[PDB]
Design a protein around this ligand. Structure first.
Ligand SMILES: Nc1ncnc2c1ncn2[C@@H]1O[C@H](COP(=O)(O)OP(=O)(O)OP(O)(O)=S)[C@@H](O)[C@H]1O
Ligand SMILES: Nc1ncnc2c1ncn2[C@@H]1O[C@H](COP(=O)(O)OP(=O)(O)O)[C@@H](O)[C@H]1O
Lengths: 7, 344, 331
């Protein structure tokens, strides 16, 4: 569905 | 048919404070149509494409120029938005839809649609920011738009079909006006060129002075600066013409409140006239308003805040009050230290 | 079909001031394309895959060489960048966007890269990320690419695809100077860098070895895949004047054509052209930014030229470039 990207 | 002298005067009637920008648009508009009059028939081969790139602060009149130009110009005009644009059309929109709306304005006239104008607001929205990625509003949108801006024939069902056929409407002839507010661009130009921070006695330091940061900095913009912003270099290469708009001057603000037919004083006094009391504004109040507006750094759109907040108390109790023939507003009312004095 | 002598003439028609660069591309392109024809019929199978590396100052026409060559040979070419990378798939699909359908036609295309020095290994995730990632890309592989975006994936070989890594290596001249020419610049007897603009640094770059690039920041494994090296020379002041007139298509020609359609003749004096060169030098944008000066200088004239009547010819004085005067109009 959506997008997730982090660190 | 196009006239650069008259067109500048026509825009002056509806727009004030941007004289240099009017000259740039008249040249590109005249050159673009002149090219189509004799298409690729001159001796000069590989003629550069004539496009427009509007760049200015908020409330500078970017959306206004597109509206005024549409009214003056005879060919159909369109006003699209980049936020709605999405790649591979999942649920939002498709790039081809922009051509469909153009035909509705042109009434499915391919000969009349190819000579149309296109204006996309919020160009910065499509800036590629894919540091942490799929991306539907980033590279995908710019990639599709660049393909269209390059000049290609795209299938468009005329009228939607009652057929399995589509028309191959050209795109190189159609003009495009990419414009929007660039936030953070000034810092990028300032980062590249500072020429300061001298600690020596001979060296000079400018902490408040920023060499007309609002207008001069824009004038010295380069394509390489936009690359760091997120745009694709090929997209900027296709637009040799860039328009720079300086911040509105206090003198310009006063003119905007008097000359236009959409002036705040004219509509507000008209509203008061419906109630039955006339509204009077002195010249001293006008220049005072300009100083406050420039401090906010919100453009003309934020001008209303000062005028409305100042009249909040007056309008609240004006209906209850009676026997007031006219209303007089002094310069102090803008500051708010002294309440306005009514006339009976 | 073409030859190194014929391509050189064609290259000279649109490019000037770079003679050594022409011979490098002619043999590399001719040989590379020759591999596509012979294929594996010859005894020497598994031939080809020779990369091209370009190092020169900004505004030297490095990008123009690829675009002009693509037009001369009518071969699809794309202009991708490595500064954006922190994807690799974007580079492969990019080329396909030219026609959106290529099985045995995109393999023979060409690609150009700009700002190759940015990826230099600082000593640092910003650098060295890309070089290790580009190794497999240069060595050849196949990547999935949805044709047109859509439900069947497409495989395209990358070994045949040629790569041209363009970029500028600032400060590299000093690095080799201490190693090969002489250790100087700070001492009394030691020669200072007095000839910043009096002499051209280019001659020193001609002796650039792969070992010198390691000190700049590059990885030796990355440079080994690009054995070919090109050393563009420093753009000359006269070259700018030549660019306005000598090439097949120049800004002056284009402007002359536009006014020619209007019916007014356009003439640029030699004195005016040299002044433009000096202004461009301060910008440090070379030819890429030269167009901007002409646009602003002639914006006022262009605005009033259609309104003006019975103007047979336009004379542009050198003062116009300075900005203290207007060009003379001949009736
Ligand atoms: N240059 C201007 N001259 C006069 N009034 C202006 C000007 N710019 C904005 N205004 C006023 O502000 C209103 C809205 O202006 P807009 O053009 O919508 O502002 P804008 O910042 O250009 O919009 P964006 O940023 O492109 S979405 C107009 O109806 C005018 O009343
Ligand atoms: N010899 C030349 N003749 C004509 N144009 C040139 C020449 N050299 C450079 N240019 C101009 O420079 C531009 C390309 O600059 P480029 O080489 O990409 O700079 P950089 O290498 O810094 O990216 C082109 O628009 C081209 O017109």
């Amino acid at each position: 569905x959506x997008h997730x990207x982090x660190x | 048919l196009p006239t650069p002298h008259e067109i500048r005067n026509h825009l002056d009637d509806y727009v004030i404070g941007q004289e240099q920008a009017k000259k740039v648009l008249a040249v590109a508009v005249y050159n673009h149509y002149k090219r189509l009059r004799n298409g690729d028939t001159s001796n000069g081969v590989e003629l550069g494409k004539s496009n427009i790139l509007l760049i200015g602060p908020t409330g500078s009149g970017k959306t206004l120029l597109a509206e005024t130009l549409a009214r003056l110009l005879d060919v159909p005009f369109t006003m699209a938005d980049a936020t709605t644009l999405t790649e591979a059309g999942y649920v939002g929109e498709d790039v081809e839809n922009i051509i469909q709306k153009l035909l509705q304005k042109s009434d499915y006239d391919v000969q009349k649609a190819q000579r149309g104008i296109v204006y996309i607001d919020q160009i910065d929205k499509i800036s590629r920011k894919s540091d942490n990625p799929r991306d539907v509003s980033g590279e995908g949108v710019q990639q599709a738009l660049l393909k269209l801006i390059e000049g290609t024939v795209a299938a468009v069902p005329p009228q939607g079909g009652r057929q399995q056929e589509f028309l191959q409407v050209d795109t190189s002839k159609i003009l495009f006006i990419c414009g929007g507010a660039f936030a953070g661009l000034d810092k990028v130009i300032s980062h590249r060129v500072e020429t300061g921070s001298g600690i020596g006695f001979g060296a000079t330091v400018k902490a408040k002075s920023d060499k007309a940061s609002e207008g001069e900095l824009l004038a010295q913009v380069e394509p390489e600066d936009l690359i760091k912003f997120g745009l694709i270099p090929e997209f900027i290469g296709r637009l040799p013409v860039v328009a720079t708009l300086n911040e509105l001057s206090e003198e310009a603000l006063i003119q905007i409140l008097k000359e236009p037919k959409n002036a705040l004083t004219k509509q507000y006094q008209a509203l008061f006239n419906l109630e039955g009391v006339d509204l009077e504004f002195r010249d001293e109040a006008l220049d005072a308003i300009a100083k406050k507006a420039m401090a906010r750094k919100t453009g003309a759109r934020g001008l209303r805040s000062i005028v409305e907040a100042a009249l909040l108390d007056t309008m609240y109790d004006l209906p209850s009050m009676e026997d007031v023939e006219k209303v007089v507003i002094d310069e102090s009312v803008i500051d708010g230290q002294s309440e306005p004095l009514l006339i009976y």
